[PDB]
RNA sequence: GUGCUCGCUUCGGCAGCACAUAUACUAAAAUUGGAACGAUACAGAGAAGAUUAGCAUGGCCCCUGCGCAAGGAUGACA
């Protein structure tokens, strides 16, 4: 009815997902296994590839 | 198994004869695995432009100053 103002919304680029700009969500979605899945996925992929390279 | 052979043979039996002709995911049981968008927990504006303030540039019209080029009209006796 009046001016729509969105809550922002951050990407989470090791999940590739889209989560909430706010302490709570972040905090959350830091220590879910799943981010801490891809964080070490991520980092094993990064040696590989420097390996290969 | 039933019934029959003028069979051996006795009613205790035997040999042969006619009919019977090929079921079943077959299964009662064996085990260890991988598992929600269901609940709780979090967030939750779950549909808007993703903006407005100056100055300078660019266009048009005058005015003023300096330079370049080409010029017009005029003025001056002893």
């Known amino acids: 009815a ?3 103002k ?6 989470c680029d090791y999940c590739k997902c889209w989560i909430a700009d ?3 969500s972040v905090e ?3 220590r ?3 981010h801490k899945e891809n ?3 991520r980092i094993s ?3 590989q590839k ?3 390279k």
């Open 22 to 24: 706010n302490r709570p």
């Open 2 to 4: 009046d001016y729509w």
């Open 39 to 41: 964080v070490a996925k």
């Open 45 to 47: 992929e990064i040696k």
């Open 32 to 34: 879910g296994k799943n």
């Open 28 to 30: 959350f979605h830091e």
């Open 50 to 52: 420097s390996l290969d």
């Open 6 to 11: 969105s809550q922002p919304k951050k990407f």
